[PDB]
Every structure is written in structure tokens, then in C-alpha cells.
Design a protein around this ligand. Structure first.
Ligand SMILES: CC(=O)N[C@H]1[C@H]([C@H](O)[C@H](O)CO)OC(C(=O)O)=C[C@@H]1O
Ligand SMILES: CC(=O)N[C@H]1[C@H]([C@H](O)[C@H](O)CO)OC(C(=O)O)=C[C@@H]1O
Lengths: 496, 496
């Protein structure tokens, strides 16, 4: 019953359908794949620094576009010729829809409502893709002309260094301009402020004043949508993406409990940025923080599943790793599972044959029950400036030393098999090199496990877990090694 | 004013006054030093595994003691000879007081009230000092005879491995027996359950079950004190010492939010274990979690101030650094500063001449205002089993890299001098080796700072901070180095 909130990004549909002359009929068909599933809400993202629709207050993606011209035109000049082709696909497809008198977002919305989906607009508040290229096609002229409006003038070590500083009146006005336009143009059920594109909105050190500013911003947005409620004659929701732990959220100027208690938002999505889905997020704590506010708390997944920040693997979640994260977060009280980067092609799970199943299963413990699942140890990609970072992997165990890993496996397993699986880096073990316990109980050595992808490029050793040992929620792997070892991977595989 | 809560431990008074034949008058005079200070409660601890008073349900510290005998006697046999002298100091003074018809806790409670100090009893729930010595004097016979009731059978790498398992009925009953006697024998204004001696109460992996069990335990205790309120004809307060972060507290089976909401407790002490004071604890989050409960949230300080876990430095807080931590924790909403291990001797601040000063200043922003303070970067010593650990120091910065450190410095500085001071390990810089910024602002190179204790044993470099840079709450040091450098210390010195 909690269900699925699914984010469709600003660029995907225009990139993947480039070169077909899209009919209103085909545009509508995109909403159909999500109909009759556990999907309750599609969050349709129309923007980055530029809009994918023909905006009158902001730059459409095709501003500067010579549609008859060659790939090497001023708008695309700054990309390598190969990347001009990909980018021109997004730009041209978007442009050609506007010329055909097709407003893709008014169409998708209309169609969502026939097919029993609540349609949302999700706004990227501070996208900074490719800001290392000040000539890039997808930056706004406002950004290009106002370097003084950026977060970090003294260094460029990351893209967020060039993000807009919302400590500026001109920056808030610039994004309130697009919100004012989206509310007037589209009759949506809700607006999602996606603060997590890219998460960083203030001068380093100013995040306190930042919190006050983003609360006063959200209140002004709530007060705008209250006027549209009258003009439309139905409730319009306001929701927000925010980081996965409450110290990080407030430390990045997002005091969400305040937003919540002031009825400024009615939905919050705790999520990582990108680098990996978090399989472990403190939902129980967020629920206590939000008690009596009537906000719906959603646990946000990302498509990547990676063991540690410096890992060279860039594989995505599978149906089994997503039922793993789903089971867990629902168990911990998630009122929605929110999918970001799980689209129908290109940016998507690699086991794309399983997408129809996924959208029919991960929105409920009922439909996850008695299905194979994988609970993988990952990491939080996002931390406030100077905030101590808690990263479990990789983990070194010296001879005679103990290391514990807690993994959230949500509902107590059904009758069947449980494996605790540990990958070892550095090119090794025998059956006794590791002593492994789960919740104190000795686990049998199984041998080398042949994982399905997502999997590491190093040996994964399996240990059979007494079923009785496994608990609701966190389950604790403890290991000791008789040889020095580095762990780069840890998961529970549960096979009812 | 928020004021001070000060904890007197189970052993200190008996160790330090050993060899004096204490009269009722001297016993009473121990309270008087705290009279006229900002101390609002004394938290009088009467126990480790054994009581320091003449208990009839538990072992007094002197069970098995031969008062006339040599140091080389069974109860003391297992210690080195010179350590027998210290232990017999505690055993004999405790014993000799009982023999003189002096109940030290009854005398302190009554003397507390005469001096306008609210007397509390603080019980150590699971003290495990010297559990490596199975024959040690201060273990209860009940512990020695029941190894099956300990937390971890399958290894012995830390003292907490031999702590009692509160998952067992027998363990709970053992601890409820002492609580029932404490409530009958002493007329205290409140009891504190000190979970944080030593914080580890459950088999590894059983902390969820644990949380239900400690809530019910707390509930019986509240119901017990409800009866004694009628018999005493006043309110009896119930409180607890819990870890510094909600996720660590709940992962060690302490759901203080549930305790607070159900009116089981009215005070919560968020505290480190021992290895260092935390100068940074998320007070603001705890206040939001506890909103509408009426629970007085106390920020716990410890006496040691150490930059990281593996540091060989074991220096205590000074007046300046307790001013710093106090100013920070009150600014963020601490409704009391709670001092553990800040006694009148032996276990005490190294600058003990400043102890009278400390007791009259650290319980109010007003009395701290315009006085020199030191805000030192430390760490959280306590993490739930397999909980990823966030530890800021030490921190390596490679040539051209940026490292950030957030230090909580509470109220905006008054006119004067603000130094960001950074210690560098490994044996050596020039004035242009570090570019140092606070909230973006270039800090002038000051040179070597001669820190008073507590201080690192490696060079400390000062950086003059433009006054107007400094914000209320966190202030961000950002540093980049022209050469690879390890940071072992960071603080803000504020010198109005
Ligand atoms: C085809 C492609 O790369 N799509 C990427 C998309 C795109 O870069 C953006 O829409 C530009 O605005 O961004 C994101 C993102 O996590 O935000 C993920 C997608 O993989
Ligand atoms: C003299 C001495 O060492 N006292 C130590 C004391 C003692 O061990 C305990 O009271 C015995 O039960 O314990 C603590 C403590 O932080 O727990 C700190 C004291 O410095």
C-alpha cells in the first residue's frame, strides 16, 4: 500500500526518442507503462539550468539552436563532435515537440490523470552538470552572465563550487520565476523542490542563515500554491528531496522538521545524491522527527550500487538488490519508495527485462514477501561541509582483530536460505581464514559465491546463516581473520 | 540559567579521604564546596558491581574484607601490592563510615537540601572495570558465578564483552533489586539510570529487542518512583545517561524519544563514554525529537579532551576548553551542562585551582560572555555494533587538495581576537604552506601559538580570523596545502 514515487528526469525522454517524429499518441504512451502498478506518483522533471518545454521566463534547452544547421553551431561548439550528436538529440526532440504544438508535460499530466496516476512536477533547484564548461549548451545565460552569484569563488574542485548561492535575492528570485511559471502553466497534483540536484545551495560556512532562507523560500512557495488551489479548486501538494540523515540535511541548510511542523511541505524524500543507493537510512528517526506533522516520508533509491566512494565499479541495482532496499526501508516505516534514475532506457537498471516486475512489487511488503532479495553494504555519498563522514568500506581486519558490519534486512526471513557474503580485495582465503558470526551464531563456510550483477571484481565468499539467528531489522556480521585481509563488499542474500 | 548537573562517582570520595577517620561534619562539608555555584543537582553514584554503602540486597565494596588483616589478603590478593594500597583506601573508608553509623548518601542528600542543591542518586547500570581480573575486589559475587549472563561468550577483546546481558530476566531483576532498595533507603529528588557505564547491555545483534526491554525496565522504575512520591510527599524525577547521537543511542537499545513521549523520564543526559568530551553533539536535533515532552536535555561533558581515538595524549579539559564546550552546547539549546569526572581531586580538571571559577561560569551564556574560550575538534568514542564511525582527525591534505573542519563555537564572538589554530603531525611549514579560510574569508598567518594544556605535542599554527567572518554556531575552517600535511589538532581560540 505505501507504493512507488518514480522520477522521470529533464533529458532522458528527449535523448532516447531522438530522430522519431513523436505523435501526441506516442508521447501519451510513455505514461502507460507505469499504469496499473504500485506507482502512485510520477515526478516529471522539466528543467536543469534550462527548461525542456518552451518556457517564457527561463531559457528552453534549444535557446541559440540552429535546427536546420550543422552539429558544429555556436550552441554545440564547446562539445566534442561525438557528444554534439547525443546533446542535439535532446535539444532537437524537445524543440520539435514545441513546433508540433505538443507540450510534453501537459500531455503526460493529462494522461497520468486518465490512468489513475497522481502527476507531479519535480524541479531541479541547482543543477550543475558540466559547469567546468562555461560554454555548455545546457547552462542558463543568467548563470553564464553572473559568476558573482556562485557558492565558492576561491576554488573550483567540484561542480557544486559553481552552483548558485541561494544566499542571494537574485538567485531565489530566478528560481521563484520558474515556480511562478510552472504553477500557472501546468495543473499538477504537486510540486517537488528537488534540493538534491545537487544538494549544495549556500556559501560554505553560511548554512545556518541558509536554513532560515530555505524555510522562508518554502513558505513563499507554499503561499503561491495556496493561491493556485483556489484557481484550480483542488489540493496542490508541496514536497522536497533532502539528504538521508537529519544532521546532514540541517547542515546543508535544509531544516525539514520546521518545514514539516509549519505545514509548509506534506511530503519529504530522503535520498542520496547519486554515487550509490543507500540501503541503510535512518527512517525510524525521521518518522519520530515528523510525528504529528502529516508529512509523507519517502525513502529515495538511486540506480547505482557501489561499495565505497573510491570504487571503480559503476554497476546499477538489480530487481534482487532493489527488493532488498525496498523490504528494509518499508520495514523501518517508509510511507513511499521513491525511484530516481530508474527510467525505461539508457539511465535504468541493467536487468531492464525486470522493470515491469519491479514497479509491481517494491511498493509493499505483501508483494516483496517470499521473494529472493539482496541487502548490500553501501555508503552515504552526501555530507555537509566539514561534517565527519561515516564510510564502512573498505574495511581492514588484522590477525586476531574483530570487525562488525550491521546490514538492514528488514522483515524476518521466510523459511528458506540466508547467506552472509563478504568480498576480499588485494588478490587468498581458506575455510578458516575467517570466523564469521551473525548475531553471535557461527556461520558454516559455503565457498566462492557466483553473484548476479551488481557484483565486485574480486572474490566473494559465502557463509551459511542459521535461519533462527536472523532478526527483524539490522543483522550484525562479526568477523575475525587469521590473516590480514581487506573487505570491499558485504551483503545478505535471502532466498525464500 | 541552565546551570550545572555534577556527578560524584562511586569510589572517589573513599579513595581521596582514605586514612582520615571521617566525622558526620566532614562528610557533610563535601557538599559545601558546590554551594553558591551554578550546580543545581549533585548526582551521587553509590555503586559499581558493588555498593559503597551497607546494602542488604547487593555486595558492599567490603564483602570479604579483613579490616585488621594485611594488604596481602584474599579480597585484595589478585592486585599488584602497590594497587592493594589504593583499593583498600576505598574499601576501608566505605567500611569505616558504616561502622561509625554514617550513611554517606543519607548525609549528602540532607546536606544538599540545606545548601539549596537538589540531590540525585546515579546508578551505574553495567560497570565493567577490571573484568579482565576475574578475582578483582569490586566485582559482585553474582557476576563472578554467572559467566553465562554476559554479553559476548565467543571472545574477550574489550571489558564490555564481559558486561551483563540485560536480555536476561536474571540480570534485570538483579539491577531492579538495588533500585528498589535505593528508593526505600534514600529520599532523593531524582534517580538517574547511568546506562553509559559502560553503554553495552545486549548480545551483539539483539539491540532492537534490547530497546523494547530497556523501555519496559524504565517503565517499572517510573511506576516504582510514582509510589515513593506519595510516601515522600514530593515529586521524584527519573533520568538517564544515553549516547550523544540518536542513531547510536537507538542502536545500543536506548529509545529515549519513546521514554520521553510516554513520560517515563524527565531528564536525558547525552554524553560520550570516557575517551574524550564531545565539544560537538547534535543538541538541536535532540531538542526537536523531545519537543512537547518537558524532558530537560543535559549535554554531558567528560574530563579528558583528546583529538582522536588512537591519540597517546591523555590531558583533561581546562577552564578555557570547558567554557568553549559549554558556550557551544548552551547556544544549541542545552537546558543543563552535566559534568562527569569533574570531581574535587584525583579524577578532576588538571587546572584544579580554576574549579571554583568553572562551577560559577559554565551554566550560563551570561557568565561565559566576554571570557576566553577554546573550541577544540574531538570525536565520538561510542558507536553501535557495526555502526560506521565518523572520526574527523587526523586528516591528511595532499598538495592542491582542500580539507574542511566544522567546529561549533556557539554565540557570535565579542570584540577581541579569534584564532583558527591547526596542529600538524609528522614533524615544518612556512607562512604560505596553508591557505586558511573561515566561512570563505582569508585568515592572516599568525605563527606558532603556545597553547596552554590541553595541548598537542606537535607544532600548533595560528590563523587570525576576520571577526565579522565568525557566525553563530558552526564555523567552517577550509584549508588547502602546497605540501602533503597531516592535521592532528584544530580549534578556535576566542579572546575577547
Ligand atoms: C543521458 C544522461 O546522461 N542522463 C543523465 C542526466 C542528465 O545528465 C541531466 O538530465 C542533464 O540535465 O542526469 C542524471 C542525474 O542523476 O541528474 C542522470 C542521467 O544519467
Ligand atoms: C581512582 C579511579 O581510577 N577512578 C576512576 C573510577 C573508578 O574506576 C570507578 O569508580 C571504580 O568503580 O571510574 C571512572 C570512570 O570514568 O568510570 C573514572 C575514575 O578516574
Amino acid at each position: 500500500i505505501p507504493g512507488i514515487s518514480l522520477n522521470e528526469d529533464n533529458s532522458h525522454y528527449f535523448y532516447t526518442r531522438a530522430g522519431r517524429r513523436l505523435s501526441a499518441e506516442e508521447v501519451d504512451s510513455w505514461v502507460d507503462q507505469y499504469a496499473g502498478t504500485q506507482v502512485k506518483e510520477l515526478m516529471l522533471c522539466p528543467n536543469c539550468m534550462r527548461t525542456s518545454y518552451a518556457s517564457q521566463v527561463w531559457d528552453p534547452i534549444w535557446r541559440g539552436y540552429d535546427p536546420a544547421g550543422p552539429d558544429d553551431q555556436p550552441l554545440l561548439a564547446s562539445l566534442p563532435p561525438e557528444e554534439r550528436v547525443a546533446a542535439r538529440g535532446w535539444i532537437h526532440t524537445a524543440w520539435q515537440l514545441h513546433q508540433d504544438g505538443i507540450d510534453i508535460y501537459a500531455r503526460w499530466i493529462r494522461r497520468c490523470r486518465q490512468r489513475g496516476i497522481s502527476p507531479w512536477i519535480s524541479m531541479r533547484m541547482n543543477d550543475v552538470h558540466y559547469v567546468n564548461d562555461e560554454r555548455c549548451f545546457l547552462h542558463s545565460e543568467f548563470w553564464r552572465e553572473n559568476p558573482q552569484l556562485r557558492r565558492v569563488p576561491y576554488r573550483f574542485a567540484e561542480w557544486t563550487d559553481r552552483a548558485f548561492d541561494y544566499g542571494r535575492a537574485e538567485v531565489r528570485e530566478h528560481h521563484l520565476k520558474l515556480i511562478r511559471e510552472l504553477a500557472a502553466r501546468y495543473d499538477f497534483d504537486g510540486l517537488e523542490l528537488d534540493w538534491m540536484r545537487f544538494g549544495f545551495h549556500f556559501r560554505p560556512g553560511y548554512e545556518a542563515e541558509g536554513a532560515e532562507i530555505l524555510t522562508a523560500f518554502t513558505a513563499e512557495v507554499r503561499r503561491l500554491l495556496d493561491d493556485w488551489e483556489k484557481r484550480r479548486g483542488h489540493k496542490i501538494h508541496l514536497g522536497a528531496r533532502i539528504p538521508s540523515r537529519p544532521a546532514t540535511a540541517l547542515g546543508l541548510g535544509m531544516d525539514a522538521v520546521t518545514w514539516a511542523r509549519r505545514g509548509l511541505v506534506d511530503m519529504l524524500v530522503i535520498t542520496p545524491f547519486w554515487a550509490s543507493a543507500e540501503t541503510d537510512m535512518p527512517v525510524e528517526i525521521w518518522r519520530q522527527l515528523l510525528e504529528g506533522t502529516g508529512v509523507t516520508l519517502a525513502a529515495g533509491l538511486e540506480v547505482l550500487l557501489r561499495p565505497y566512494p573510491d570504487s571503480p565499479l559503476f554497476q546499477t541495482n538489480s530487481l534482487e538488490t532493489v527488493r532488498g532496499a525496498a523490504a528494509s526501508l518499508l520495514d523501518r516505516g517508509a510511507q513511499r519508495i521513491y525511484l530516481f534514475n530508474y527510467m525505461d532506457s539508457q539511465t535504468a537498471m541493467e536487468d531492464l527485462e525486470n522493470y515491469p516486475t519491479l514497479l509491481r512489487e517494491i511498493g509493499s511488503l505483501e508483494t516483496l514477501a517470499g521473494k529472493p532479495r539482496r541487502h548490500v553494504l553501501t555508503f552515504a555519498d552526501t555530507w555537509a561541509p566539514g561534517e565527519p563522514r561515516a564510510i564502512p568500506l573498505p574495511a581492514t581486519c588484522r590477525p586476531g582483530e574483530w570487525r562488525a558490519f550491521r546490514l538492514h534486512t528488514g522483515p524476518k526471513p521466510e523459511p528458506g536460505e540466508v547467506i552472509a557474503a563478504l568480498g576480499i580485495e588485494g588478490g587468498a582465503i581458506g575455510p578458516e581464514t575467517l570466523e564469521v558470526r551473525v548475531n553471535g551464531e557461527l556461520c558454516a563456510f559455503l565457498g566462492l559465491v557466483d553473484l548476479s550483477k551488481p557484483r565486485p571484481d574480486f572474490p566473494v565468499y559465502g557463509f551459511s546463516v542459521p535461519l533462527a539467528a536472523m532478526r527483524r531489522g539490522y543483522n550484525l556480521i562479526e568477523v575475525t581473520a587469521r590473516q590480514e585481509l581487506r573487505f570491499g563488499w558485504a551483503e545478505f542474500l535471502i532466498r525464500p
